[PDB]
Each structure stands twice: as structure tokens, then as C-alpha cells.
Design a protein around this ligand. Structure first.
Ligand SMILES: Cc1cc2nc3c(=O)[nH]c(=O)nc-3n(C[C@H](O)[C@H](O)[C@H](O)COP(=O)(O)OP(=O)(O)OC[C@H]3O[C@@H](n4cnc5c(N)ncnc54)[C@H](O)[C@@H]3O)c2cc1C
Ligand SMILES: Cc1cc2nc3c(=O)[nH]c(=O)nc-3n(C[C@H](O)[C@H](O)[C@H](O)COP(=O)(O)OP(=O)(O)OC[C@H]3O[C@@H](n4cnc5c(N)ncnc54)[C@H](O)[C@@H]3O)c2cc1C
Ligand SMILES: Cc1cc2nc3c(=O)[nH]c(=O)nc-3n(C[C@H](O)[C@H](O)[C@H](O)COP(=O)(O)OP(=O)(O)OC[C@H]3O[C@@H](n4cnc5c(N)ncnc54)[C@H](O)[C@@H]3O)c2cc1C
Ligand SMILES: Cc1cc2nc3c(=O)[nH]c(=O)nc-3n(C[C@H](O)[C@H](O)[C@H](O)COP(=O)(O)OP(=O)(O)OC[C@H]3O[C@@H](n4cnc5c(N)ncnc54)[C@H](O)[C@@H]3O)c2cc1C
Lengths: 271, 271, 271, 271
């Protein structure tokens, strides 16, 4: 039996977001997963990084640098207990589900702050091993997002522009950076305009997906092996890769578009 | 004299971010601007949306919906005073500078939550008048960002991928959505690896830019006039525009890439 | 007609507390009172004092002192609007009824916070005119309290001890301090164990009382004229009063027991 | 090594209250205590009881009864996580210090609400084991209170009346009810008028006390063995105890004064 962590970022128990969290928990438990939750609002989770995250002696309190100081605290065991509790959930989890409403084309502040306080250096990432070599490479993450705006608004021709671009900084920059394999997002568009019977179907479809979630093909990101991962090389794509790619019509991903066509639904559908 | 608002999102007065805020304030005042600040950490700004943003009876406490409830509060004059104070700063400002360290490929949680609590419907945006028709269309906004990662890491061939994609959800989805003209971002890369003398030069360059900031050409976003802005049309680009654009090599912008090449530095450099 | 304010502190419209509020309103209106309500839960009332209660420029933001700063805000008209609205209800009211369940031997937190945010200096009390000389001396206040525990538990020989002691800090320290004449409390004991027919009678008895509430004799507190109200005298009782009281068997009141027998039911029954 | 919880109820880090919290923490740690904090303002602690405190299915949602429903949630494991986190601190702690300014003759609303949400039935009290038989009987609690008013104002002859009466509902009704042994309160009077050198001495004296706090004799309350602890007997003092007491000049405590002289400083000094 595998272990799941569901991180929910919605204040209301009456919300569709809460219903999706409940559906996920029920489906995963039915298949013998252990399911742990971080209901950030119900926890009254503190989302602001500060010196109070470090309970031990600071290396340099006169010139406080959160990255270096937090890493030290992580290694020496003097992170704030609330952070440690979340890190333990993450360490235990095979699968991490993030359930949230899209807010200002991104994650809610309370969830952004959870990443900032919880994804501490060494624990969640290291430059020595960015992206596919990162600490969470044995784990899978998935975004389950609800929106006010319709799917069409986020189509290539839609007023808001391509959802693939919106997803990229979260899926690549936060989740994949730390090593996660990122599964296809569950995208629930214009949930405020969805009829009751269709909402029931959304919940059922999500539970169905979760029955086999671990076997899905993850989204495609450019492997780190394509890059020279040192400062002399500027962390740039290897010359021989650049030469090879010059004859290809499509770029590799949203962020690695290389000035060419982005492969369709790079951040929404696996190859 | 014009009026500037500088929103800072950094806890440390000793930081480079704070120095950039101070430099901006000094340069703008030298040119006769009135300068107001929102130092979110110094203000102990509350970044989490909740029912306590409404300082009275809720319309529907059994099914609390923040968008509708906040708009009602805005209209009836029942928003939390801390929010009202920030809205008044915004109303007064011609230019809004956001000074922050890049955190997890986006704005700090405290700044994300400032957007969430302060950019209330009717006040900051409406569906009836999205994007270039929005309330802030007579104002200009600029991001001033510091990063840990080098510029090369965020180049087209860099391990992180294109900075233009990272900037898009903030510049288009938050700032431009509300009407702002968005100026070229001030991008200060790998500030933790920059020698002392060069840091002094960064401060000087920012002050110099600010001397003439109001004359700059803003970034290019697709005008809303290219779209049919109603639910029946799905907020899609007009057919005649779609036909015309098939002859252009580059998409309109990062989000409106249309499955083609993204115009280079669309979110970094003006035409 | 006189004017009544009923302040209710209970979340449930289905509660006996809510029934008592409804009964009070109906009885007072029948006798030609104007009745205004502060249903704190239904108002979504914020019960926590903070600097956000003051919307104008603080005297000293570096050393924030709530008493001095709130008084300034009161005088200059820059208290938070929710507070101002409550203050206006109070100014209008002749009679103020507090309807609440006893919680942890006192008022519910939401009502405690209402006192803290609403009973601002100069408005509700002044050191220059404490107690019977205070701003609300033309008003009358009454507590209507429901309890889980039986009356016997709160008798002199009861496990919880004397209810007169429990009532003292509220009736003397909050209500009388501000000038109110305090009427006998309506004490509804063990309301969870009261049979249906008796509860109907409780509602009827409360309405009956309210028909003539304004004519009742208030509770006895020691008049301020018994004290030397200045720092040099330590706000101590006048010596000639002290001398006189040495020949009285009972202390003056619960708080002014003087190391003697407390007059029976000092905080429950008028002389 | 024993465990301490310090619960602070003050918004300002610049406050004397905050300094007393810091002093307590430093002194206890120096003597090898483990010290945990609940800085209620810094936590943005939610102080209002409601149905949202119960995350599971309610027994009777049509007639919501907080006592019964919260106890069920406690037993079934579906109390709100923020409450559970506080309960875990309490469970761990040997000593609990409450540091707060006196506000309207009691605890700040935010602290009152902490008691209301955290001291759930079965966890913190039960009828079957009130007072000296309660769940926290192996723990010790102490109030550390600052006041605006001078000590003389709270003397027997003082305008405010006896501080022992003010303390009783908190120390007996909240702390002792749950089983705590209650230590002598640290009473810091008129802290706004105290000279600089004396304030330094207050901090030092508090630290000194804390060095040996565990060895102090607690305050005297009437033992529950003096009472018949069942509904039929009305939780009244036993007849044989009543007979024995009849010839004694002094009552037993503030609340059990029995119509006679209150033993001096019953809630301030151990006997
Ligand atoms: C600050 C802010 C910024 C925003 N920015 C954006 C943005 O950038 N882009 C965008 O597109 N949107 C945006 N939104 C809108 C937001 O994404 C949506 O409001 C949100 O996704 C709605 O999800 P919900 O769970 O709150 O829905 P709700 O409105 O709470 O619920 C939807 C419906 O599902 C029902 N429901 C609940 N439980 C069940 C159940 N068990 N079974 C069936 N039905 C059930 C509810 O009763 C309701 O009818 C923003 C909103 C806010 C507040
Ligand atoms: C949670 C988190 C997430 C992050 N995510 C990302 C990410 O996604 N991408 C990324 O690239 N980076 C990321 N970073 C790194 C972050 O962007 C940098 O640490 C930040 O930009 C550094 O700016 P600062 O103001 O803190 O500089 P500081 O480190 O405070 O200052 C840098 C230097 O400037 C000096 N200085 C200060 N004042 C002056 C002055 N007046 N004149 C000259 N020199 C001065 C300082 O002494 C120091 O030498 C993240 C950091 C955090 C904490
Ligand atoms: C956090 C907390 C702390 C507490 N601390 C204390 C304490 O220190 N001391 C103490 O003694 N108690 C204490 N209690 C108990 C509390 O005081 C009682 O539960 C409360 O007073 C009950 O009043 P209610 O309005 O909720 O009654 P309810 O239980 O809501 O109603 C009482 C009865 O009246 C019925 N009813 C409702 N409306 C009507 C109507 N119109 N006509 C007739 N019947 C009606 C209901 O069905 C029910 O049978 C505490 C409770 C809480 C939650
Ligand atoms: C709503 C409300 C109701 C109130 N009701 C009552 C009431 O019923 N009865 C009553 O008596 N009072 C009452 N007060 C007054 C209140 O009890 C006092 O204002 C409070 O106790 C003062 O404590 P503080 O920590 O706020 O002190 P501060 O004013 O913050 O500090 C007091 C002094 O200590 C100094 N100090 C700070 N840190 C240190 C340090 N490290 N070392 C040395 N000195 C230091 C400060 O600079 C200042 O000079 C009420 C206040 C409010 C806001």
C-alpha cells in the first residue's frame, strides 16, 4: 500500500474543492492507500517565511538570508515544528495531490507560502541535483484545479491565453524542480456554471482516475541530461543537443520552446 | 507631479531588495514624484483572503463565495480597513513598482495575497471591461525582480527555461487584466553572486531608468479588440483576426502564441 | 418610546438564546420601544482588537498603545466603521440587553471582543469620571444568561461557588465602570435540562419582566462618592466611609466585601 | 526535564507582555525545560467557536450543540487541525503559563476564545471528574498579568474592588475546573507607570521565580471531596462538612465564602 498527501487550499467545507479532496481521499483509501491531509485553512497554516521559521542560533542575524539559514536549520533540526510536521508528511508520501481554486492565474497565497516555508533547500531541492535528479524523484505530484473562467478562455485563442503557460511555473518551477514526476493536471473549468449532475460526474471521474493514478505516464519535461549543469557552461543546453534540435520544428516544452512551436498541451497531456 | 506606489515584499531591511526600494524612492522624489510605500512585511500585512475581509453581515454565510461577497463589500463600503487603505494607495498612484525576490518562480506569498485581498472585483477589474479596458488603464506597473539563478539559466537554452514564460501569468494575468500598462521588468539576476562594485552599479542603473520611466513604451499584449468578449463567443479571438494572424510568423504574445513561435522577449522588452 | 439594543452572542438561530432575543424584541416592541439588534455571529463580527481598528495616522506606530491610539481615533473620527456603527447603536439606546450562554464562567469570546473593540475610552469610560459618573449613566444594562450547570451548583454551597462572584467582573468591571445602571440579571439555569412547558414559561416570564423593566431598582454598587478618586489617595475609600463601614456587618458589595460577609445576592438582587 | 507551554495574548512584540514571555522562555530553558509557545496574535489564532471546529459528520446538524458535537469530534478524531495542534501542546506540557494584559477585568478575547475552542469536553474536563479530579491534575498553571490600574485600585478598599474576586472565575472556573493546580499569579500592576529600573527588576524577579516554580505550593481551592458530586445532591457541600464549617469564622475560598469572611488573598497567595 502506497502513501498519499492531499494539500487543500480552500477555506469553505461547502466548496467543490473540499468535495474533490473528500472524493480523492475516499477513492485512494478504497484502493488501500494511506491518506494524510494538509487542509491549510483548517490548520490556520502560517504562509509567511521569516526568521521565526528557525528556532536555533542564526549563522548571521545581522544579514539574515532565508535560503542559507533555513537549510542550516533543516540540517541541524531547528526548523519551526509546523514546518517539520509538513516535511514529515512529504517524506512519507509517494503521491502528492494539490487541490485548489485558481486564483490570479496561480496557486492561492496560503499554498504559495506552504511551498516557501516547507520546500527548504537540501530537503526539497539542491542545485547539485536539480529537476529529474531532485529529492522527490521517487514521488509523483498532481494539480487538481478549479477555475471561474471557461475552458475556452484558456484555449490558444482565448482571452486569457494558453493554460499550458499558466501551469508551467508551478509544474516545472516548483514541482519538477524538486524531482517530482508531474502527472496530467485535473482541470475543472467554470465550476460555478457546471450543473449539479455534471458535478457529480466530475467527482466520479476523478475517483476513477485515482484508481490507476500511479501507472499514468507523467508530463514531459526536458531531461537534465540535455544540459551542462555547471556555471562555466551557464547551465545551458549541450552543444550537441542544440545542433540536433536545430532541425526540429517543435521546441521541447513550454519553457524550453527554443523560439519554436510549443508541442500541444505540453503541461496538460503526457505524450 | 505624478504619484508612485512602491510595493516591497522582503522581510530584511539589510536586503538588496530594500536597497532597490530606497533607490527607487530617492530617484522618483528627485524628479518631483510623490512616493507612497507598501512594505508588506513591515506592515505585518495579512495575505490570506477570508470572510473577515468583510466587516459586516455576509450575503450568504452558508455558501460563502469570496468573489461575490468581496465585490458586495467593496460596493457597500464594508471591506476590511487594511484592504481599503491599499485600494486608496492604488487609486492615487500613477506608477506602481513591485519590488521582490523571485520565489518559487513567482511572487512571494505575502505579495500574492496582497493581490488576492486588494484587487477586488469592480475596484480592480470587471468582466465587462477586461485587460486594456480595465480600471487601471491610466496607470503603469513595473516588476523589479531579484533572482538567485543566473540570467543564462533563464535564457531560451537555460535549465530553468524562458523567463518570458515565468513573467506571463503575473504581467498579463494580474497586472494587465486590471488595465495596467506594463513596463519592461527590471531583472536583477544572481544578485547573491554579484560583486560589491557591480551591485552599486545596479542601484545606479535603476535610478537612471526611473528618471524617464513614464516615457517608456510598455510591453505588448494582444488588444481586447481582437476578441469577442462574451460567453456565447467563448471569449475567443475574432475569426477575421485568426485568419489575418495565420500569415504572421510569431504569435501575438507568450500566452497568445497560437501554436507558433513566441515573439522574442515579449514579456521583457517592448516593441 | 424608549430605545433598546439587544446584543446576542450565540451562533445558532435554533438556540434558546435566540428565542430569548426574539421574545425580548417582541415584548419591548409591543410596549412601544424601538428595538435594534447586534447579533454578533450573524454580523460576522471581528472580536479581536488591533491596530487595524484605527484607520487614520497613528500618534506612535513604533510603540502602538491601543488605549491611547483608539481614543485618538474615536475623537478624530477614524475608528473602523464596524466599531462606529456599534457605538452609534449604543449612543441611541436607553436599555441594553446582553443575551448569551455562560461560557467558561464568563461572556463568549465574541462578546468579550465586542466590549474590547467598542467600549473605547472617552466614548464608554473616562478615568476622570469612573463608574456612576461614566458616559452611560443615563442608560440601563441587563445580563440575560443561560447556563448548562444547575442553580444549586452556583449556590453558596455549590461546587462551582457563588454566582455573585462570577457576575462581578462583568457587571461591575465592564457595565458599571462605564456608568450603566445594572438591573438584576435574568439567570436561566440548566436550560438543557428544563422541560418543554417550563421553557415556554421562561420566555413568558422574561417578556413579562420587560413590560416594566425601566422601573426596576438596579443592583447596588458602592457609589464613587465613597472613594478618593485620585492617584495620591490610591483611589481608596474615604477614611470616614471606612470608619463608618467598620460598624456594618456586611461588606458593601462583592468586590468591596472588605473582608466581611458579602451582602446576599449583591449581584443578583436589588436592595 | 519538564515541558512548559507559554500562551501569550498580546499583539505587540514591543510590549512588556512580550518581554515577559521572552524572559519566561529564557529562564525555563536555562533550567533544562522544553518550552513551546502559543503566541495567539502571531498565530492569527481563530478565537470563535463554531460548527467549523468539527470537520466530520454532525450528530444533529438541525439542532447544533457545541458541547456535545465537539466532544464527539474529539473522540472520533475530527476536530479542526488548529485545535488539535493546541491540544497536543497542552497534553505534552507539565507547566502552562498564560501571559496577558488584563482587559476589561479578564483575559483578552483571543485568549478567552482559545479556552473555548481548545478546552473541549473529555479532553479538558468532564462532569464525572470536576476540579481536583480533572484531566489536567498532574499539570500546573499560572497567570502572569499586567494591568493599567495600580495595586491600590484592586485592594479591598480600592475603587475596582478585590483582585481576588476578579481572578476567581479564571483560576477556579477555567483552570482548576480542568484539574490544574494553580500557582500564585504574577501580578504586574500599573506597568505603564513603572520606572525603568523597576521594570528590569520585574523581569528578573519573574525569571528568578521560574527557576523553582515547580516546587511552589499551589493556591487553595475547596477539595471536591467536600461535595456530593451527583445531580440528585445538586453538587452541594456535604451535610457533615456544612455542620463542621458553621462555627468557623472564615469561608473556604473566594467562591466558597459561605456568606462569611473570605480568607485573605485566597486567589493571590498560597496558605
Ligand atoms: C482571489 C481570487 C482570484 C481568482 N482568480 C481566478 C483566475 O485567475 N482565473 C479563474 O479562472 N478564476 C479565478 N477565480 C475564481 C476561482 O478559481 C473559482 O471561484 C473557484 O475555482 C471555484 O471553486 P469552489 O470550490 O470555490 O466552487 P464553489 O463555488 O464553492 O462550488 C461550486 C459548486 O459545487 C457545489 N458543490 C459543493 N460540494 C459539492 C458536492 N459534494 N457535489 C456536488 N456539488 C458540490 C457548490 O455548492 C457549488 O454549487 C478567483 C477567485 C478568487 C477568490
Ligand atoms: C522561498 C524562496 C524561493 C526562491 N525561489 C527562487 C526561484 O524560483 N528562482 C530563483 O532564481 N531564485 C529563487 N530564490 C532566491 C532569491 O530570488 C534570492 O535569494 C533573492 O533574489 C536575493 O535578493 P535579496 O534582496 O534577498 O538579496 P540579499 O541576499 O539580501 O543581498 C544580496 C547582496 O546585496 C548586498 N546589499 C544589500 N544592500 C546593499 C546595498 N545598499 N548596496 C550594495 N549591496 C547591497 C547584500 O549585503 C548581499 O551581499 C528563492 C528564495 C527563497 C527564500
Ligand atoms: C465553550 C462552552 C463553555 C461553557 N461553559 C459553561 C460554564 O462555565 N458554565 C455553565 O454552566 N455552562 C457552560 N456552558 C454551557 C452553556 O452555558 C449552555 O450549553 C447554554 O447556556 C445553553 O443555551 P442554548 O441557548 O445553547 O440552549 P439550547 O441547547 O440551544 O436550547 C435549550 C433547549 O431549549 C430548546 N428550545 C430552543 N428554542 C426554544 C423555544 N423557542 N422555546 C422552547 N424551547 C426552545 C432546545 O431544543 C433545547 O432543548 C458552556 C458551553 C460552551 C459551548
Ligand atoms: C481593551 C483594553 C482593556 C483594558 N482593561 C483593563 C482593565 O480592566 N484593568 C486594567 O487595570 N487595565 C486594563 N487595560 C490596560 C492594560 O491592562 C495595560 O495597558 C497593559 O496591561 C499594559 O501592558 P503592555 O505589555 O501592553 O505594556 P506596554 O505599554 O507595552 O509596556 C509598558 C512599559 O514597559 C516598557 N517595556 C517594554 N519592553 C520592555 C523591556 N524589555 N524591558 C523593560 N521595559 C520594557 C514599555 O516600553 C513601556 O514603558 C486595558 C487595556 C485594553 C487595551
Amino acid at each position: 500500500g502506497r502513501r498519499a498527501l492531499i494539500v487543500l487550499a480552500h477555506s469553505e467545507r461547502t466548496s467543490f474543492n473540499y468535495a474533490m479532496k473528500e472524493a480523492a481521499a475516499a477513492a485512494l483509501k478504497k484502493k488501500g492507500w494511506e491518506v494524510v491531509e494538509s487542509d491549510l485553512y483548517a490548520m490556520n497554516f502560517n504562509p509567511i517565511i521569516s526568521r521565526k521559521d528557525i528556532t536555533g542560533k542564526l549563522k548571521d542575524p545581522a544579514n539574515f538570508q532565508y535560503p542559507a539559514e533555513s537549510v542550516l536549520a533543516y540540517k541541524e533540526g531547528h526548523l519551526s515544528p509546523d514546518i517539520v510536521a509538513e516535511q514529515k508528511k512529504l517524506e512519507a508520501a509517494d503521491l502528492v495531490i494539490f487541490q485548489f481554486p485558481l486564483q490570479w492565474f496561480g496557486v492561492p497565497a496560503i499554498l504559495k507560502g506552504w511551498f516557501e516555508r516547507v520546500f527548504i533547500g537540501e530537503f526539497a531541492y539542491t542545485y547539485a541535483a536539480m529537476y529529474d535528479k531532485g529529492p522527490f524523484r521517487s514521488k509523483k505530484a498532481v494539480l487538481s484545479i478549479t477555475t471561474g473562467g471557461s475552458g475556452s478562455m484558456y484555449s490558444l485563442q482565448g482571452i486569457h491565453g494558453d493554460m499550458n503557460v499558466i501551469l508551467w511555473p508551478i509544474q516545472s518551477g516548483i514541482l519538477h524542480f524538486c524531482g517530482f514526476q508531474v502527472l496530467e493536471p485535473q482541470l475543472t473549468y467554470s465550476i460555478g456554471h457546471t450543473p449539479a449532475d455534471a458535478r457529480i460526474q466530475i467527482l466520479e471521474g476523478w475517483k476513477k482516475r485515482l484508481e490507476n493514478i500511479w501507472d499514468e505516464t507523467p508530463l514531459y519535461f526536458a531531461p537534465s541530461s540535455l544540459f551542462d549543469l555547471n556555471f562555466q557552461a551557464g547551465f545551458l543546453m549541450k552543444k550537441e543537443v542544440q545542433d540536433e534540435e536545430k532541425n526540429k520544428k517543435f521546441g521541447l516544452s513550454v519553457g524550453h520552446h527554443l523560439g519554436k512551436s510549443i508541442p500541444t498541451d505540453n503541461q496538460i497531456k503526457a505524450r
